[PDB]
Amino acid sequence: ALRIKVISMGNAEVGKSCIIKRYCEKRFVPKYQATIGIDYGVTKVHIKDREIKVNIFDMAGHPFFYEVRNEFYKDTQGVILVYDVGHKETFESLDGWLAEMKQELGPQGNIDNIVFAVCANKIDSTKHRSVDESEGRLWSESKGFLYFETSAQSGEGINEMFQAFYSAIVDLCDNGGKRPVSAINIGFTKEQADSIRRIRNCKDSWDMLGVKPGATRDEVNKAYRKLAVLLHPDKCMAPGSEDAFKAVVNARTALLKNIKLEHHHHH
Ligand SMILES: Nc1nc2c(ncn2[C@@H]2O[C@H](COP(=O)(O)OP(=O)(O)OP(=O)(O)O)[C@@H](O)[C@H]2O)c(=O)[nH]1
Ligand SMILES: [Mg+2]
Numbered sequence: 001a002l003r004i005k006v007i008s009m010g011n012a013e014v015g016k017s018c019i020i021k022r023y024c025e026k027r028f029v030p031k032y033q034a035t036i037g038i039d040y041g042v043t044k045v046h047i048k049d050r051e052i053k054v055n056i057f058d059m060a061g062h063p064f065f066y067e068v069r070n071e072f073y074k075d076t077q078g079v080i081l082v083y084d085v086g087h088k089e090t091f092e093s094l095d096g097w098l099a100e101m102k103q104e105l106g107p108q109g110n111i112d113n114i115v116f117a118v119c120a121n122k123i124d125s126t127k128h129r130s131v132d133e134s135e136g137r138l139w140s141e142s143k144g145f146l147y148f149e150t151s152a153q154s155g156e157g158i159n160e161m162f163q164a165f166y167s168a169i170v171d172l173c174d175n176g177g178k179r180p181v182s183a184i185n186i187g188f189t190k191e192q193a194d195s196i197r198r199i200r201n202c203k204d205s206w207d208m209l210g211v212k213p214g215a216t217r218d219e220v221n222k223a224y225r226k227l228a229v230l231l232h233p234d235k236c237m238a239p240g241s242e243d244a245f246k247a248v249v250n251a252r253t254a255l256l257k258n259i260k261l262e263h264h265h266h267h
Contacts, residue, residue: 002173005055005075009097010082011090012061015121018152019082020058023162028152035060037068047166050173054166066100073104077177078169081145082119088130094118094139113179115168116145117161124151144179181234188238195230196244205251217259224252 008016017035022028024043039058044051057072059065081097083090102109118140120131133149140147146164150157171180202208206215209223228249229235233242 001051001053002170003053003055004077004169004173005057006078006080007057007072007076008059008080008082009101010061011084011093014061014082014084014090015119015150015152016061016080016082017058019080019119019121019150019158019161020056022152022155023158024056030153034062037065038072045162045166047163048170050170052166052170069100070104073101076114077172078115078117078165080117080119080165082121083131083136084122085120085129085131085136085149086122086125086127091120091131091136091139112144113172113177115165115172116140116143117165118145118147119150119157119161120148121150121152123149123156124154178234181237186237188236188241189230192230192236192238192241195227196238196240199231199244199247200240205254208247208251209255211255215255215259217256220252220255220259224248 008020010016012034013032017033017039018028020041024041035058037060039056041056041058043054043056045054046052059069059072079101081094083094085091098111102111105111118136120133120136123129137147146161146168148157148161148164150161152158172178174180199208206213209220209227211220211223215223228245231241231245231248233245236245
C-alpha cells in the first residue's frame with residue numbers, strides 16, 4: 001500500500017480547502033473558514049488498482065502563515081496549486097508560490113519529480129472572469145504541470161483533476177519517485193540537439209562547458225550543472241546524449257583537477 005504526501009498552495013480565499021473537502025468528504029459550504037496555518041488529514045484512494053494512503057497538508061494561503069508553512073514543503077509527491085479565475089492577482093502570484101516552495105527545498109530540490117495539478121477554480125461564478133483558459137493552461141502546461149478548470153461549488157472538473165493527479169503520482173511512484181519519461185514527447189529540444197553536436201566537435205574541455213581558462217571552481221560547477229540538466233540521458237531522449245553527458249562530466253573533472261593543482265603549486 002502506497003503512502004504519499006499532498007499539499008495545497010495558493011492565495012487566500014482561492015478554494016484550496018473546498019477543493020479537497022469536495023472530493024474527499026463529498027461536501028461544500030459557501031461560508032469561508034480560513035485555514036489557520038495548516039490542516040492535516042489522511043484520506044484513502046484506489047487508483048490503478050494500487051491502494052494509496054494520502055497525507056494531505058492543506059496550507060493556509062495568507063502570507064502571515066509563511067513561517068508556519070515552510071516546514072511542510074519537504075518530501076512532497078503532489079501539489080494542488082489553485083487560483084481564482086475571477087481575481088487575476090491570485091494567478092499572477094503563482095510564480096511567487098513556486099519560488100517559495102523552491103527555496104524551502106534547497107538547491108538539491110527538483111520540483112520536476114513532483115506532480116502539480118493547477119486548478120483554475122470557481123469557473124461557476126457569474127462574476128467577470130479575469131484569467132482565460134489559454135493563459136493558465138500555458139503557464140501550467142509549459143512547466144510540466146496538469147491544468148484543470150474546476151469548481152468546488154458545482155463539482156465540475158473536481159473528479160477529473162483528482163483522477164489525473166493521483167494517476168500521475170502513481171506513475172511517479174512506480175518510477176522510484178523520479179519523473180516518468182513520457183512517450184508523448186520522446187522528442188527533444190533544439191538547444192539539446194545543438195549542444196550535443198557542439199560537444200562532439202569540441203576538442204577542449206574549457207570550450208566544452210563554455211568557460212575560458214582561469215575560471216573559478218564555482219564557475220565550472222555552474223556551467224556543468226546547466227549542461228547536466230540539459231543532457232542527462234534520463235531527461236534527454238536525443239541520440240548521443242549519453243556520450244555528450246559523459247563528455248561534460250569528464251570535462252568538469254579535467255578542469256577541477258588542474259584548477260586545484262595550479263592552486264597547490266602556486267598559492
Ligand atoms: N462560487 C464559488 N465559491 C467557492 C469555490 N471554491 C471555494 N469557494 C468559496 O470561497 C471561499 C474560500 O474557500 P476556501 O476553500 O476556504 O479557500 P482557501 O483557499 O482554503 O482559503 P485559505 O485557507 O484561507 O487560504 C469560501 O467561501 C468558499 O465557499 C468555487 O469553486 N466557487
Ligand atoms: Mg483553506
